User: Fold this.
Amino acid sequence: EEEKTEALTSAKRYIETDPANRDRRTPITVVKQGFEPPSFVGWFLGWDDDYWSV
Amino acid sequence: RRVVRATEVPVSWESFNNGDCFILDLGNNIHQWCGSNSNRYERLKATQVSKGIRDNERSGRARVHVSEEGTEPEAMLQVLGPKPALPAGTEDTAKEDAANRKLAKLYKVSNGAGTMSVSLVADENPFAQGALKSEDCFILDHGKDGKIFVWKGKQANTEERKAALKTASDFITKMDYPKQTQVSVLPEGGETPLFKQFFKNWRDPDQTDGLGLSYLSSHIANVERVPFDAATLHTSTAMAAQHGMDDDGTGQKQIWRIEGSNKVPVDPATYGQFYGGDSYIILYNYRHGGRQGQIIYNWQGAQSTQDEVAASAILTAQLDEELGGTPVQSRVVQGKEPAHLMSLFGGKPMIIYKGGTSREGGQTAPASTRLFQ
Amino acid sequence: ETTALVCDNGSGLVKAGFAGDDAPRAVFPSIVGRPRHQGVMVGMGQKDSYVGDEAQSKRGILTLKYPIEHGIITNWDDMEKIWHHTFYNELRVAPEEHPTLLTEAPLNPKANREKMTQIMFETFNVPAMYVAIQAVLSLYASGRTTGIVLDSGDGVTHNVPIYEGYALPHAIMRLDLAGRDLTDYLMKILTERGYSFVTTAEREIVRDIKEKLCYVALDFENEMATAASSSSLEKSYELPDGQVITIGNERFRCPETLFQPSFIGMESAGIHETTYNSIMKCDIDIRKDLYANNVMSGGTTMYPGIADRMQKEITALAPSTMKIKIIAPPERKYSVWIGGSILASLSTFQQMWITKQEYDEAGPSIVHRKCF
Amino acid sequence: DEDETTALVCDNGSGLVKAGFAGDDAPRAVFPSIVGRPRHQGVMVGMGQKDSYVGDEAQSKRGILTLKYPIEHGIITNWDDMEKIWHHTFYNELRVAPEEHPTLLTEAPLNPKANREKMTQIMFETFNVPAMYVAIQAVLSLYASGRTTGIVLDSGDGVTHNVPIYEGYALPHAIMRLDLAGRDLTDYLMKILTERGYSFVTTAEREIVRDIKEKLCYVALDFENEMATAASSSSLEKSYELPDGQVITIGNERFRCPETLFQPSFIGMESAGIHETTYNSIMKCDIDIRKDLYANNVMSGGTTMYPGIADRMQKEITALAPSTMKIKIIAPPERKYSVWIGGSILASLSTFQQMWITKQEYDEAGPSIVHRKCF
Amino acid sequence: ETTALVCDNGSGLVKAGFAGDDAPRAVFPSIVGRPRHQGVMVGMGQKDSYVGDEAQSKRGILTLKYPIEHGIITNWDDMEKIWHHTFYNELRVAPEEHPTLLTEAPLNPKANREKMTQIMFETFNVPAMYVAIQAVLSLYASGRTTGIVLDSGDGVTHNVPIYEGYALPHAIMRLDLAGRDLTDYLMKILTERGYSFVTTAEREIVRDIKEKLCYVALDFENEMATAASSSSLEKSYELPDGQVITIGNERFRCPETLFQPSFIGMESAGIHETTYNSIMKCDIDIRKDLYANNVMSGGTTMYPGIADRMQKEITALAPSTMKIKIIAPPERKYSVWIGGSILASLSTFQQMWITKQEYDEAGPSIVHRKCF
Ligand SMILES: Nc1ncnc2c1ncn2[C@@H]1O[C@H](COP(=O)(O)OP(=O)(O)OP(=O)(O)O)[C@@H](O)[C@H]1O
Ligand SMILES: Nc1ncnc2c1ncn2[C@@H]1O[C@H](COP(=O)(O)OP(=O)(O)O)[C@@H](O)[C@H]1O
Ligand SMILES: Nc1ncnc2c1ncn2[C@@H]1O[C@H](COP(=O)(O)OP(=O)(O)O)[C@@H](O)[C@H]1O
Ligand SMILES: [Ca+2]
Ligand SMILES: [Ca+2]
Ligand SMILES: [Ca+2]
Ligand SMILES: [Ca+2]
Ligand SMILES: [Ca+2]
Ligand SMILES: [Ca+2]
Ligand SMILES: [Ca+2]
Assistant:
């Protein structure tokens, strides 16, 4: 969980420190394993739903 | 008994007794002989003086032997002769502790008062190591067996040193010492361990106090807890790219697929049409003028099993060695191809099918309805 | 048409089977057990020596001897008993019509190599044989050809860097510290809690305790402070006579001899310094992929947390621009056998076989020239 | 020289307690460490019938007592009886108050840790000593001989241990411990006396068999020739008188009993003998220091007091070692008390006063100070 | 009136003594040993750091470190321990009374020279000091003013051309293999006979084996053929614990790393053609006497047969219109000290000292303008 929280802070600091200025209120959305929205999934070439499930 | 001391005695069997301990020094070999009636403290002093003669006078270029009655080596019997009967030994009383207490006279030589001064520091040993001041020159006179030590300080003047040597030479003829008396000149940090025995608890500067600690010669990671800064991510985007793959990839290539335990060539109408559950080897020849050259790529599908990828690696190494070792290899998995490998087919896409060959099922039939991304 | 045999003879275990298969058929410990008590009941089934799992099942009344001590073979009659047991009793096959692939640790004395030939063509009369390096078989079993292999079993622990499918002989390093030494160290440090283990059967029990209840701490001093401050790390084990023992900090002190060899009194450095100096003795251009392909093999690399600790120690030693990937497959206990099984089953392999004819015209020196 | 001290040295071994003052040449109080309790019905009221007897007065009344050793193979098991023996040796033997004397204690290597914390706790809380220290017995045995380099085989009543020391530095990885000593030899002699028909079962009979072992047993130079000599003739038989006047005769049992030290398979132990234990202790030391460890074999403890054990020890190590090396074995006649003599040396050394575990260090650090200060 | 001191600081063997002597008074190895176990017998002379030949005596219970590696001082505090042991324990003199001559490696960095000057004048308080070069003192001890010097000790091998009594910096060439790497290669090639030498304590044993039993073969292939066929060159050595090892073809294979660096995986050139590469970098007119004066210096020139092999290898690839002669004095392991002892005792050297007051109003920078 400390990986999760300090990764949230690191993702925020990665947003403000980019050279091309972007929107400071760029939203951080937490995604769980096995429950992914299609917005996350659509960037992956060849998603398998039953990859992690044995 | 309490104040144990060493005294030089002439080298003969008649000088030996059974109630003391003896050290026979023969250069590179030192023999320690312990009497049967000798006690604990003079055995410990014999060990200490023998290790001092080894490690300080000879700098470790010696070997110390410890012996008792009946176990004398050939060296002691060769030097001293055949062994007579020993004339026993007196019990260790307190009068010879007082005799050992009166053996040395520590004198001072100093021009700190503006004039010549030879004065008595002490006549009662064990002396104090702190009494040896670093700005003066001291004299120890154990001249009964013929030893006079001139100890020089680091911050002593030259005329103090010459006066100390002159006074030590003057001690020869005044008190009527015998005509073999050695005047040993000793600087700070270079003291003879026959000089050291008259001092209460001599301390070398790099001694071990207590049990001590090991050095261990090897250490594990003890990195400090730094917070990580994320601005190094999008900045400093270093990249190496390719080193010799400058061609656009028309070339002349051969593609093999591994089935079971053997590779076969694929059909030449089907270059960029791979199976996801198979393993492939691609040999590629440079037509480019950069000294020609050959590339062997080892492509491994994601659905491919362990036997196929292991056989692909072994056949890749065998194909490298049977061409003389001139080509260089590049392991590649599905999804992680370089830009040069995608350019081998000449503007064609890489078609990846589903399924493949196996040792027990062979080639899988394709599905009726197929979807491609 | 004849199926070749693959027989990985380790210091602690023997993994034997047929080429082309995915798993070894016979896995059994390489011990020879002999009776030490007086037999009073006549007839029955008393034998002069017991080999393998039969010696494990009767180990209360047997003294147990390992033929292999720190990689080299000390007893050859017992090793012949091991080979006879794995041919005739385990695989139940006649070895005079099957070529046999054998494995060997690198920087071994040369006198073993012809001697392993000297039994195989004279007693069992194999048609062909081959000797392969264990590390290149482990690297082949991962599907890789360039990388560094840390092979750590029961006898030795060696780092081998391999480039283009050939090991570099000027950078192979050997460390005589493996699972038997960790077992002996765990026997030493279990006396602190009052448990005495001196018998070879008790050595087998402590080896089982080491397999079930040991792990590598990510940092040693903080874990020692945690074990001192509470009792959350304590675990219980049941001895076969029903006695229950409890171990605390000794769970993680026994793998730490891998990273700090001074616990058992060795001046030599740990496995991470051994990997770093093995990488540093290679050429400058090929150091990039040696750090990125760092596979692990053997049963001694099966502790929890060994890969994270190894990446932590290598990362502190390497330059920060380098990328470190410690590769720990779940099948790494049998990776030597899998690489040998795939390598023996190939159709292009049947000319590197050292057959009978060149052996008995060349003598016991053909193995030094055909097996590189 | 060395400065005067008022310390106490108490070698509390498995069989005997040897207590005395530091600086003396001999321990003042030597007595067996047993606690005796009566097992019969007391019908005569009066005359001070105690509930428990400790030390030499338990030996005088051993017929009507059951005797217990609190120390078994070096480990203290019954702490109440150990506290009783410590109270007896402080108050009834040395006749001193422990509040103004530092105490030096002895211990075998490779004991459990809890023995060391409980020794710390009963010395500091019950007796209120101002200082305390525990030391390894073989280090003291090498102190008594006057040497620095050597391997020490110390064999008492419960523990037989080999410790190698080069210069002042010990090698902990090469230390060997074997639970084969005078207890096991006494029990084996109790077993093999049944071959002649003499049955000894009780604890007082065990003390009688221990006296027989001390007064009659010896180590044969070679076993099989001595068996043939004992079988052929009757010159090796010797007699002993029991305290009720019965006379027994023993033959080969004189030398079969200490042979268990060289062949532990007589009592079912698969471990090797003391010669192989010494040889494998030398082999785990690295290659540069074997030559000095061969020539400085030091034997200490009461179990090393058989006649002929040094010659047999010489022959077996000479057989095991290569022929170019010279093997010398140091067996002083005072080796029964050499642990106490080395404790008397070490407590009086001027370097040692900065290593006492004081009272305030124990008060701030608990009983776990002993593993950071001692060894 | 006072006598100067000469101290040649080798990378593995330091030499010291008084000026005007035909031999160094003290030869002892430049090591610093530290204990690796705990000293439980207190009050019996345990030290935290054993320096020099004393550390060679009790080398089993110590870890050894070399303060000078590859001819250059790296660890400075240990070098102060070496110098303190040299002055106070070994030579038994006060440094305040005696001037001191030191020797340095060719192409020494300037900061090491300044730091040598600073610890020489501050810590020990010498009244005078001078720094010289290894190879020019070797050439002066040979009685020449022009020649090539092959100085090969324990750390590095230097080829230094000297013309008119001064070196040529553009042609001084450094080859980084010496007796340390020969010792390490001998530990490598004794493993096939079954002997293992891993720690720094028994590296000295392998160094003694290399010194007592090694030779340079005049031709390598026929020597290997006769070693393979017969057994007339196999000889035994007695390890100091009593075991006896035997060595065969490894007796001559271990000096051959100097002529073939590929035996240890080093891609550089052998010792014979790097002298050719140095002498081609010199001017065309001065090569006639430079070829004729082939001075060999250092301890690893003391193999038997190295001079004849060097004569053959230079004569093979130099042109046939000139004569090659190799000189090898019997005192060539002490020749730097002999040149320093001649240099310090001259009647023109008292003005070339760096006195204390010149360092006082000059700082640690006058060493460049005077030692030149
Ligand atoms: N007879 C010999 N045969 C072979 N090697 C020898 C012999 N005598 C000495 N050596 C080796 O020579 C080296 C020491 O030589 P030398 O004292 O000239 O070198 P150094 O001054 O310490 O080194 P460097 O000049 O590189 O700093 C050691 O490696 C030693 O093993
Ligand atoms: N789960 C485990 N955890 C820790 N160690 C293990 C585990 N399984 C096996 N080992 C160790 O691995 C060693 C054998 O490893 P392996 O290399 O497979 O056999 P060999 O060494 O005979 O080739 C044994 O000594 C055993 O102690
Ligand atoms: N003369 C002797 N011969 C053989 N054994 C002896 C002799 N004297 C004492 N012993 C044995 O020594 C053992 C105890 O010796 P010691 O080490 O002094 O006591 P502890 O073991 O209590 O320290 C006793 O068990 C006794 O059997
Ligand atoms: Ca006396
Ligand atoms: Ca003065
Ligand atoms: Ca497939
Ligand atoms: Ca290639
Ligand atoms: Ca293995
Ligand atoms: Ca004892
Ligand atoms: Ca030199």
